[PDB]
Structures are given as C-alpha cells and as structure tokens.
C-alpha cells in the first residue's frame, strides 16, 4: 500500500487476523472442541483471502494504473507479481 | 487475447474443456459410477481455474502493461475487471 | 449422484456449463473483445466451482452418511475422495 | 483434531502462521515496500488454505469415518461441516 490510508486499512486487517490466529492457538493449547477449531481456521482462511484481494487491487492500482509510467516499467512491475497471481488461482 | 497467438492458445484450452464437459454429460446420461463423475468434475474445475489464471495474465499484459497509455485509460481498464478480480478470490 | 433428484440437478448444471463454454468458443472464433472473453471465462470458472461443491456434498452424503456402513467401508470411500478435497 | 499427532501438526501450522502474520504486521509498521507486503500476504493466504485443507481431512476422518456411528449421527456431524466445505 503506497498512500497512508491504504497502509492504515491493511494494517487494520492484519491485526484482526493476528487476533484470530492467537485465539485459534489458545483453543488448540486449551483443548477446545474440534468443531470450534475447524470453524476458526475457516474464518482465518476467509480473512486471508479477503486480505489478498484487497492487496492485489491496491498493488495493481498503485503500480500499473497510477503514474506517468512507461510500458517497460509496467512490464517489470507485472513480472514481479506474475508468479504471485498464477498461484492465486 | 489481443494477438493471434494468444487467441489461438486460449481457444485451444476452451476446446479441451468442451471435450471434458461433453464427456461428463455423457457419463451422467450413461449412469456411470458416481466417483468417476466426481473426478471428471474435479478435472473441469482444475482446467477452468488454469484457464482463468492464464487469461487474467494475458488481459493484464495487453491492457495494463502494453501500449503508450495514460493513467486515466488504465483506470477505466482496471475498473472493468476489478470486479472479476475480487470475485476471483 | 445416486438419487434421481440429485441426478437431474447435476446434469442441469453441466448443460448450463456446456452452453457457457460453447458461447465462449464462439466469441473466440468470432474474434470478440478481450474483456468479454475474460468475463465468460470467469463465469465458467465460477460455475465450475459451484458444481464441484454440489457434487462433493452429494458424494459425502451418499457414501459417508447414508447406509449402515462400517468404519472400514467409510475409510476406503473417504480415501478415494480425499486428495480431491485437498485441491478444492 | 483428536489424536496427539494430528494435534501437534496443526498447532505447528498455526504457530508458523502466527510467525508470518507477525512478520507481516512488522513490515507494515516499518513502512516496507508494497511488493514485499503483497508477497507476505500471499504466503499467509497460501498457508491459511493448506491449514484449512489439513483440518478438513482430519475432521472428516475423525467424525465421519472413525467410530461405530449411525447414519443419523453422521448426518448431524456432516451438516455442521457442509457450509464450510461449500465456501472452501
């Protein structure tokens, strides 16, 4: 995220997830039911996906859309993400 | 896909999928075992995913990287597919 | 799918997919815009997933839930399906 | 997870996720480049997915396969998980 507001809202998502992952680690140590564990992991998966989507859009918008850039510059930028994107599906 | 070669290899992938979807429809009519159908379905999901990844990459290369475009042009192009990408994950 | 009710609803999904894929093949043959093509491929991927889901739930219910089975019988049936679930 | 080995290996996955998320939280606080962050976020998505996968397989084996259960018991257990599978 380039702009402060983007940085801000991504950090907010990450701290939420950290909290979920901490709650999940507690439940494993404390021997909480298998069902609950499965549910918590599903919540973490959903939130990680959601974070990935927002972050992909921010990155593309910041590096491929904005700025009086050249196609050569944007090609390098696209290549850096290409591996990430293939994996995303 | 803009270039003829890109159009060609996507059409090639789609025809492959058509073949699978045709075979699967056959297996359903023919009362073939459930496991096989589940498998054939899994292969179609797999090829559909792979087709998506590749097309996303081609589209991003053709509309966001290539061409002496303005940031305004790229924003319209990015918005046209923003929804697809969110949906893609 | 075992039951007629589950068998109709799966075929209906496939024929729907068939149609989308033929339309997609048509748009590629006719040289239509990238955007249109991207959008249909995305609709086909989505329909592929929905179908995978409906079919997984059917298979689990038919082979793991229904029937007075032994854990051994269910272990075999589960194993043939497990790798698929991992990929999904 | 029921067995100690399935319990250890899931905890090990969660702790590694914990680590990645704290590392990610760190890069954001410190103002590191966009690309690094996208990459770390992508590794966490990947790890979340793998964990979901492993846990689904563990849950299905422990509650649908193992144990002299009735189809009625398995139906209740299956329904509790069905939604999760669809979204997955």
Author numbering:
A (entry chain B), B (entry chain C): 2 to 90
C (entry chain D), D (entry chain A): 2 to 89
What do the paper's sentences say?
Regulation of the frmRAB operon upon formaldehyde accumulation is mediated by the first gene product, FrmR, a DNA-binding transcriptional regulator. FrmR is a member of the RcnR/CsoR family (DUF156) of (predominantly) metal-sensing transcriptional repressors. Upon binding of an allosteric effector (e.g. metal ion), affinity for DNA is weakened, alleviating repression from the target operator-promoter. We present the first in vitro evidence that formaldehyde is a direct allosteric effector of Salmonella FrmR.
However, generation of a variant FrmR, responsive to cobalt and Zn(II) in addition to formaldehyde in vivo, is achieved by single amino acid substitution at the putative metal-binding site (Glu64 → His). The combined effect of tighter metal affinity and weaker DNA affinity of the apo-form, relative to wild type FrmR, confers metal-sensing gain of function to FrmRE64H. To identify the sensory site(s) of FrmRE64H for metal and formaldehyde, diffraction quality crystals were generated, and an x-ray crystal structure was determined to 2.19 Å resolution. FrmRE64H exists as a homotetrameric assembly composed of a dimer of dimers as observed for the structurally characterized metal-sensing regulator CsoR. FrmRE64H has a kink (∼45º) in helix α3, not observed in (any) CsoR structure, which is enabled by Gly83, a residue specific to Salmonella FrmR (distinct from Ile83 in E. coli FrmR). The electrostatic surface potential highlights a region of positive potential composed of positively charged residues from helices α1 and α2 within a single monomer subunit. The pyrrolidine side chain of proline residue 2 (α1) is in close proximity (3.0–3.2 Å in the four independent locations within the tetrameric structure) to Cys35 from α2′. A second FrmR-specific proline (Pro5) acts to terminate helix α1 and positions the amino terminus of FrmRE64H adjacent to Cys35. Pro2 is the first residue identified in the FrmRE64H structure and is positioned in a pocket at the dimer interface, leaving no space (and no observed electron density) for the amino-terminal methionine predicted by the primary sequence.
